[PDB]
Amino acid sequence: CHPCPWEWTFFQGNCYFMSNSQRNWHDSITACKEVGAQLVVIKSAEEQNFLQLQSSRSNRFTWMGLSDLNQEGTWQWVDGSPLLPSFKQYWNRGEPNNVGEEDCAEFSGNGWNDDKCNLAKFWICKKSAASC
Numbered sequence: 001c002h003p004c005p006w007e008w009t010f011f012q013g014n015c016y017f018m019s020n021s022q023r024n025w026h027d028s029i030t031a032c033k034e035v036g037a038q039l040v041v042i043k044s045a046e047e048q049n050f051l052q053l054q055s056s057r058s059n060r061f062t063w064m065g066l067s068d069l070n071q072e073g074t075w076q077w078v079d080g081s082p083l084l085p086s087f088k089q090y091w092n093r094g095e096p097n098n099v100g101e102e103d104c105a106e107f108s109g110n111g112w113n114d115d116k117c118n119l120a121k122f123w124i125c126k127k128s129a130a131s132c
């Protein structure tokens, strides 16, 4: 037994899958469900710092489970949870700008950016880590 599956990353009781292939946002949601996970929902500040560092180093635009598709301007996580005011400090400068209609969030550089949901990007899945 292993806390996390092969190629996954462990951090604070959860396993994260950093994809090596690309998908649009909706298909990323499905990809995660197919492996018993969810497109990453950041539930804490320590988690954000950890993920941002890995994403920045990967130098890849990467989807997270956050969108304002249902109501422009109101960002909600895929589990139905609302984005908190304390997490809003993570957007890059000038973001979110909804330029050309951007309703999905991605890790970009050292922060977050909103981009077109139909764009294919890497993604991160999250599921709980097993204890053995």
Ligand SMILES: OC[C@H]1O[C@H](OC[C@H]2O[C@H](OC[C@H]3O[C@H](O)[C@@H](O)[C@@H](O)[C@@H]3O)[C@@H](O)[C@@H](O[C@H]3O[C@H](CO)[C@@H](O)[C@H](O)[C@@H]3O)[C@@H]2O)[C@@H](O)[C@@H](O)[C@@H]1O
Pocket (backbone or CB within 6 Å): 092, 094, 095, 097, 099, 102, 108, 109, 110, 113, 114, 115, 116
């Ligand atoms: O600090 C520097 C900067 O470095 C990284 O890249 C910056 C740049 O990345 C994205 O554009 C990439 C290319 O996209 C097309 O191929 C061309 O436009 C080409 O000229 C670009 O280089 C993109 O995220 C961009 O952000 C702007 O566009 C997006 C998409 O329309 C929009 O959502 C943003 O609000 C903004 O207008 C970004 O500047 C990244 O690590 C950056 O985070 C970093 O700041």
Ligand SMILES: [Ca+2]
Pocket (backbone or CB within 6 Å): 068, 069, 072, 101, 102, 103
């Ligand atoms: Ca919109």
Ligand SMILES: [Ca+2]
Pocket (backbone or CB within 6 Å): 068, 069, 072, 073, 098, 101, 102, 103, 104, 114
């Ligand atoms: Ca939007």
Ligand SMILES: [Ca+2]
Pocket (backbone or CB within 6 Å): 095, 096, 097, 098, 099, 102, 113, 114, 115
């Ligand atoms: Ca943007």
